[PDB]
Write a protein that binds this ligand. Structure first.
Ligand SMILES: COc1ccc(Cc2cc(-c3sc(C)nc3C)[nH]n2)cc1
Ligand SMILES: [K+]
Ligand SMILES: [K+]
Ligand SMILES: [K+]
Length: 217
């Protein structure tokens, strides 16, 4: 048997230019349109991601929900020399795919992959991976986990004033708990970027929530 992630990686390895992230991203994009399937972010959302990374130029990025490494290849190619991406994947096999995917893209020295569940890994980040603070967090895992993982980062001390949270799919299927909190909390300064997946009927969006640091008085 051959899973379909294995087939995407086998397509990349066969049709993309080694060491060239853009070529890798286009091979995956092309396999998806032909074999009718899709990664966790599309092109429109990629461009939103691209702008955020370019605007804030983060030295340390956490991604929750790697899948194939498509989004890791997307973000890590924009990282400056010295900057690194930590990405979490809960499914062992997908995590493995993501590593092979990064290896082939040449971005493997910038990205560390962690196989595990976010609520187990986030607490170990300081002690076991020498994280002080995160500069940017991309959330694209389980919807019910967005709001509690956010406060888990908060409690663990992994956010500093200026940390940028970028949450995917806050509209479709929606993360209404998470949205309400960052939009209502004084600890965040939010902005919504809309992604038009289909005219009138499928209109999603990412939420960019800027941590404002603990209060003072
Ligand atoms: C619709 O359901 C899904 C939504 C997103 C994904 C991709 C994914 C999510 C994760 C999780 S979940 C968790 C507590 N920690 C992590 C790192 N790893 N990979 C898989 C299924
Ligand atoms: K997504
Ligand atoms: K920086
Ligand atoms: K707010």
């Amino acid at each position: 048997g051959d899973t379909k992630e294995q087939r995407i990686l086998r397509y990349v390895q066969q049709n993309a230019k080694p060491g060239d992230p853009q070529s890798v991203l286009e091979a995956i994009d092309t396999y998806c349109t032909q074999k009718e399937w899709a990664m966790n972010v599309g092109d429109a959302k990629g461009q939103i991601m691209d702008a955020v990374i370019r605007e804030y130029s983060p030295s340390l990025v956490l991604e929750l929900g790697a899948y194939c490494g498509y989004s890791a290849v997307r973000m890590a190619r924009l990282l400056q020399p010295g900057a690194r991406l930590l990405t979490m994947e809960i499914n062992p096999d997908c995590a493995a795919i993501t590593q092979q995917m990064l290896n082939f893209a040449g971005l493997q020295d910038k990205v560390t992959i962690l196989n595990g569940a976010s609520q187990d890994l986030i607490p170990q980040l300081k002690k076991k991976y020498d994280v002080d603070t995160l500069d940017m967090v991309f959330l694209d895992h389980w919807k019910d986990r967005y709001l509690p993982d956010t406060l888990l980062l908060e409690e663990c001390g992994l956010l500093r004033k200026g940390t940028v949270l970028l949450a995917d799919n806050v509209i479709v299927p929606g993360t209404p708990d998470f949205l309400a909190y960052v939009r209502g909390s004084s600890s965040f300064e939010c902005t919504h970027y809309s992604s038009y997946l289909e005219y009138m009927k499928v209109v999603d969006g990412l939420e960019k929530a800027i941590y404002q640091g603990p209060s003072s008085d």
